[PDB]
Structures are given as structure tokens and as C-alpha cells.
Structure of Ribosomal RNA methyltransferase, putative:
Amino acid sequence: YRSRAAYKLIELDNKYLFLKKNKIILDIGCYPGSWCQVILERTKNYKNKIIGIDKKIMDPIPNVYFIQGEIGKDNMNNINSVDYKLKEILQDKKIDIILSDAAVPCIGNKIDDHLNSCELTLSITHFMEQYINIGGTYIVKMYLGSQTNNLKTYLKGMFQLVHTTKPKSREIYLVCKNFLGR
Ligand SMILES: C[S@@+](CC[C@H](N)C(=O)[O-])C[C@H]1O[C@@H](n2cnc3c(N)ncnc32)[C@H](O)[C@@H]1O
């Protein structure tokens, strides 16, 4: 694995079992690429499309589509470039599993870092809503804090179920199952 972050995705998929055959999968904040590697392993003899997005250029991985871009900036609809690159890949399809291991640099003021994390989470969520397939899974990392539950409740407005994982500036994942729309 290119990063020890791979083991976080292994843990997530072991518990929540979302990596399945015949799914289109997007990995946001993919650099240097270990989640992409885990996704490849777990879907080894399956038909899938695996897409990675990061503002940093990732070294290519065979059978993974990479898109350089900052979600919240390089996609057009926020609170063209990423969108048109997705269009090339997806055509008329939406994305079954959207994962985000993205994070904003810490300034060393806990509350500000949490608010910044909220802002990033909202940007990624706004982008997710455009591209997620009905029935799709969305998992997003954030710094746990005062607004986490607000965000969880917001997500419960568009998914059948939303779970907060165990904290690990502590970080959690919001695991969202079965996109239903608003
Ligand atoms: C911890 S790294 C991800 C490690 C990755 N999951 C792996 O296993 O190789 C977090 C990444 O999020 C990216 N990132 C932060 N904000 C982003 C954004 N708005 N859009 C795309 N990527 C972003 C960073 O550039 C960074 O590479």
C-alpha cells in the first residue's frame, strides 16, 4: 500500500460491506492512492469503475481513473473541469459509492479546524448529491466536534441510514447508506 491509510478503508469495508461487484466507485482525496489500491483488491474479479480525485497529482494506478481537482472549487456547482472529466468517464451514469478521506490542513485552533472541516464536508456533500446514484453509499471523514451531529442529521435527510464511526482533533467517518434524495 502507498499509505497506511489503506487500513482505515479495510476497517470500514469490513464493518459496513459496501465494496461490491458492478459498482462505480469514487475516492475523493485519493492521494497517494492506497484507498484506490484497497478498492482494486476488494473488487479484484469484479466489473467496476474506480475513480480517484485529489487536488494533488497521484501517480497512475493501472485500471484507476484519476482526476486532478479540488472539490468545492474545480467542480462547477458548489454551495467545469471535474464535471467534464466525470462526464467523459460516466456518460449518463451516476456513482454508486462515494468515499472521502479528504481533510483540510490544521491551523492549531481546534474549533476553527472543526469549522473548516465542516465547510469541506459541506462542499463534498454538495458535490456528492449531484453524482450519487439512488441507493448509493457515501462515506466522508471529518474532525469530530460541535457540528458533527448537525451534519449527521442533515445527511439523514437524504439517506435511509447514517452512522457515525468511532473517533480516532479526533476524526470520524459519517457512513451513509441508501441514497433516497431529499
Ligand atoms: C489523508 S490524504 C488521503 C489518503 C488516501 N485516502 C490514501 O489512502 O492514499 C487526504 C487528501 O485529501 C486531499 N484533499 C483535501 N481537500 C480536498 C478537496 N477539496 N478536493 C480533493 N481533495 C482534497 C488532499 O490533497 C490529500 O491528498
Observations:
- The helical segments are 6-16, 34-42, 81-90, 110-131, 148-156.
- Residues 1-182 form a domain with the Rossmann fold fold (CATH 3.40.50.150).
- The pocket of S-adenosylmethionine is lined by residues 2-3, 5-6, 28-35, 53-56, 70-72, 101-103, 120 (CB under 6 Å).
